[PDB]
């Protein structure tokens, strides 16, 4: 009365590693004393009809063994489903199951966690952080994303977006409001992502950049006329030596903040030795030229004072 | 009739994970009986017979031999090919088998540079680099070949293949390009073949097509800022050129300063027609008095007559 062993074997792959047009799965129940032995094929826990499989018993000597075969199109198999083969013997239930094997070296997943903008954190006083994950397998409801705080203090209610991409990927983003003081006084905020496809869970962390805070130094510009060529003018701003990098920058017109799409502003870039710098360009128009000739380039930054802002202006005299 | 061989393998579990030992099974079936010899080849070479073991079932006319080899998960995952070779009545029959290939691997990147305006125009010895990253860490498998749209021959290339620390291979070849040919049409083509590529890669680069426009320069100086007397910063705005490819340098005492001394930006999108960049330099005491003048130079295609533009500035 050997408890029967059950083992599944399958069509192999050709010399170059490729898959064959059909995939055969052969369930093997070997090493047993005869009787009733009932084989059954589950797909992902569901049943599929007995008319896709065949059974063969062979009794050799005292022992006994049964083999059963199920055929699969390449597509079904590459659709990554678990197929279980389940035998009933003596009231017991034995089973073995199989799906296709894991990629040995697949892509691969990127997770980005932002810090809140100096604008958002100082001016609007509604600072938020964002967690972003790209290149997940395009199946919703598998991804799990949780926020923490190093202090274990309670966190606000976040808001999630799972969005299926054009290139057959899935991108999930959750954004969180953060306690506006808590950011400034210490406080590491954590973003944790788990997926079955990922080997370990992904943790990304974010926090106030520790360092030697120094304020920005702004200078306002414009280019001399290249006359007869169209109209208007172009003007730009050089804001530099600040620490740390986090900076917001904007242009008003008589206290009207101009849309981000109006000015092209660069990303904070390093300097040889100490400090960072940005440069931002705005092309004005002849209407506002005369309307009021003043234009303001403002920098929100942590170390600016009093209000964490430094303004400046310029025209053509 | 002749018989037929198929191979079968131990299978991965529900979680799609390998087990510690991969059994491979040869099934020769459907033949006239008698002499049946089975060899196992690992990678195209014979194996020690000890872990290879045969057996033969028959009913009436139907007759099926089976041989079985066991492998360790390690050996299987070492990317070896396993050939089952059947000698029957002085003939041979074959099936081989390998680990099943990845469904969604990354995947390899390839980048082809254009030469720099500096490289073209000033020191006239332009080149392009075709760089290929994330190849499998094994040498001599890769084939990288240069060629032209014009069917005309190419200069000799130089080729490095250097194993990276993260277990990839980066193979990089630079090709001297004709300083003339580049300006008259002339698409250069880079082509890499590797066993692990489903298809050959090709990248191709050429002079960017468009309405050539010269650059406009604006030099500068900063209002002194408190606490730094002896450190002053200089600016150069360069705007509305085309195409985007632009070189930029700075000249003190009529000598080119190290490209590490200043920092230019990447030519970015104008809202209108054109492209623009910005570059800053940071000078000091010594530079103050050597002479005080500073050149901000841009080498551009549409620059004229000599393919450069320079604006001078001081304090």
């Amino acid at each position, epitope marked *: 009365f050997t408890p029967p062993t059950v083992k599944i074997l399958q069509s192999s792959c050709d010399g170059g590693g490729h898959f064959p047009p059909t995939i055969q799965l052969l369930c093997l129940v070997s090493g047993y004393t005869p009787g009733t032995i009932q084989i059954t094929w589950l797909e992902d826990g569901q049943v599929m009809d007995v008319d896709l499989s065949t059974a063969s018993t062979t009794q050799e000597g005292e022992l006994a063994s049964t083999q059963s075969e199920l055929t699969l199109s390449q597509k079904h198999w590459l*659709s990554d489903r678990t197929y279980t083969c389940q035998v009933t013997y003596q009231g017991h239930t034995f089973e073995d199951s199989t799906k296709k094997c894991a990629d040995s070296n697949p892509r691969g997943v990127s997770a980005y966690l932002s810090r809140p903008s100096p604008f958002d954190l100082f001016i609007r006083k509604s600072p938020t952080i964002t967690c972003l994950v790209v290149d997940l397998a395009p199946s919703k409801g598998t991804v799990q994303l949780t926020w923490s705080r190093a202090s274990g203090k309670p966190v606000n209610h976040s808001t999630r977006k799972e*969005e299926k991409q054009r*290139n057959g990927t899935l991108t999930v983003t959750s954004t969180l409001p953060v306690g506006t003081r808590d950011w400034i006084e210490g406080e590491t905020y954590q973003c944790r992502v788990t997926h079955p496809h990922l080997p370990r869970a992904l943790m990304r962390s974010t926090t106030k950049t520790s360092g030697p805070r120094a304020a920005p130094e702004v200078y306002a510009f414009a280019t001399p006329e290249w006359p007869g060529s169209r109209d208007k003018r172009t003007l730009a701003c050089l804001i530099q030596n600040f620490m740390p990098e986090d900076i917001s920058v904007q242009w008003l017109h008589n206290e009207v903040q101009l849309p981000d799409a109006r000015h092209s502003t660069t990303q904070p870039r390093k300097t040889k030795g100490s400090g960072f710098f940005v440069f931002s360009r705005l092309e004005v128009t002849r209407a506002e030229w005369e309307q009021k000739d003043e234009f303001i380039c403002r920098a929100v930054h942590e170390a600016a004072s009093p209000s964490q802002t430094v303004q400046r202006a310029v025209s053509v005299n | 009739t002749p018989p037929t061989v198929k191979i079968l393998q131990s299978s991965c579990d529900g979680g799609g994970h390998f087990p510690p030992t991969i059994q491979l099974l040869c099934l020769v079936s459907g033949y006239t009986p008698g002499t049946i010899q089975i060899t196992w080849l690992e990678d195209g070479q014979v194996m020690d017979v000890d872990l290879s073991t045969a057996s033969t079932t028959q009913e009436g006319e139907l007759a099926s031999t089976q041989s079985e080899l066991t492998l360790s998960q390690k050996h299987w995952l070492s990317d070896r090919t396993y050939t089952c070779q059947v000698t029957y009545q002085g003939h041979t029959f074959e099936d081989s088998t390998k680990k099943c290939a990845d*469904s*969604n691997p990354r995947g390899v990147s390839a980048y082809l540079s254009r030469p720099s305006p500096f490289d073209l125009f000033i020191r006239k010895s332009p080149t392009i680099t075709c760089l290929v990253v994330d190849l499998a860490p094994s040498k001599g498998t890769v084939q990288l070949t240069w060629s032209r749209a014009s069917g005309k021959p190419v200069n000799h290339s130089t080729r490095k293949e250097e194993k990276q620390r993260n277990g990839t291979l980066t193979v990089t070849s630079t090709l001297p390009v004709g300083t003339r040919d580049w300006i008259e049409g002339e698409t250069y083509q880079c082509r890499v073949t590797h066993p692990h590529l489903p298809r050959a890669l090709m*990248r191709s680069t050429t002079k960017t097509s*468009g309405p050539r426009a010269a650059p406009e320069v604006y030099a500068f100086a900063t209002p002194e800022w408190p606490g730094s007397r002896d450190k002053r910063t200089l600016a150069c705005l360069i705007q509305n050129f085309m195409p985007e490819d632009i070189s930029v340098q700075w000249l003190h005492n009529e000598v080119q300063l190290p490209d590490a001394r200043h920092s230019t930006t990447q030519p970015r999108k104008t809202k209108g027609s054109g492209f623009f960049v910005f570059s800053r330099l940071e000078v000091t005491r010594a530079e103050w008095e050597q002479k005080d003048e500073f050149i901000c130079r841009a080498v551009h295609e549409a620059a004229s007559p000599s393919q450069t533009v320079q604006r001078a500035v001081s304090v």
Partner: antibody
Amino acid sequence: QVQLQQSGPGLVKPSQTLSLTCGISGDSVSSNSAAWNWLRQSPSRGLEWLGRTYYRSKWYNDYAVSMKSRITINPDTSRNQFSLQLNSVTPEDTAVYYCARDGEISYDYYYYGMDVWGRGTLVTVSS
Amino acid sequence: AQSVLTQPPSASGTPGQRVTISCSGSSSNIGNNGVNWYQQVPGKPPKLLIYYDDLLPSGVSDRFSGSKSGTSASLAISGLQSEDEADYYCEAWDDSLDGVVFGGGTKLTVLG
């Protein structure tokens, strides 16, 4: 180069199912980094997308939904082709059907466009 | 019933001038994703012109341009010709449908 070739019947009885297959050369149906679409055009309903199939770690399908209840796209990976099957047709299902390749261009990439097309096939629904 | 992205059924030109075609949609499609344009000279299959709002691929004329702001987009043809009479189609990827979404079509006539 890449190339797509349609084929199938051009006459379907009402209530029956249309089948049209599209074989490709110059690429693989099973390829990552691209995707395989079925589209249709009638002067009445304009140009109209039906479905898509493509492989990453698994086979995925995206249907129009719109009509997902009558349609199956699914690849024959041996013959390197993919096939559209639409159930229960009516005259409204008369159109010129196109198979097309949605994949990338290069460089910056991530950007998809359906840049390769089949000649089209005229399917007409009648008794 | 009718389509998802909205574009005017008719547009017109004179052999030297520049005309634009409008494309309106939602955030689920044009807002969070990029836009493609196609040209159709019927009995023939569609031919790609613009991709991800701004781009021109190989074998395409630079007088063909494109733009996008918010939930809408525009295709600008300048310096027209005779073979420019065509059905012109815009499309984007809608990620609340998981699917490709097209425009109604715009028939482009050139008189003169």
